[PDB]
Design a protein around this nucleic acid. Structure first.
Length: 93
DNA sequence: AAAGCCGGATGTGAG
DNA sequence: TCTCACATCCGGCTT
């Protein structure tokens, strides 16, 4: 968690700690489908994790959208705040 | 309406 | 350096 520096890694570690389920949680752990339960809250954690000021979900969602073309994380269509990891942490590296 | 999601255009700071 | 990995902003589309 603390050693993490990329957004996909930080999101993955929060999804591994049950103390953060009210921010972000698995909906299908095997398929690596997760839901962002608190968009504004998760953005606050991401900004604090990067020692940054004024991090918002609008800006953080843009970073997730860059993962679309890179085949790292894809958004489940038609659903709200439902995303899917396309690669394991090893496949991304 | 108004908020959620999209990708373009550019900035930025670390490596 | 350029590249990388977002960060910042925004108009257009969608819900």
């Amino acid at each position: 968690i603390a050693d993490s520096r990329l957004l996909w890694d930080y999101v993955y570690q929060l999804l591994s700690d049950s103390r953060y389920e009210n921010f972000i949680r698995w909906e299908d752990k095997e398929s690596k489908i997760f839901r962002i339960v608190d968009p504004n809250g998760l953005a606050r954690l991401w900004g604090n994790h990067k020692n940054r000021t004024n991090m918002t979900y609008e800006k953080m969602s843009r970073a997730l959208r860059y993962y679309y073309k890179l085949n790292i994380i894809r958004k489940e269509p038609g659903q709200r705040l439902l995303f899917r990891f396309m690669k394991t942490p090893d496949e991304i590296m």
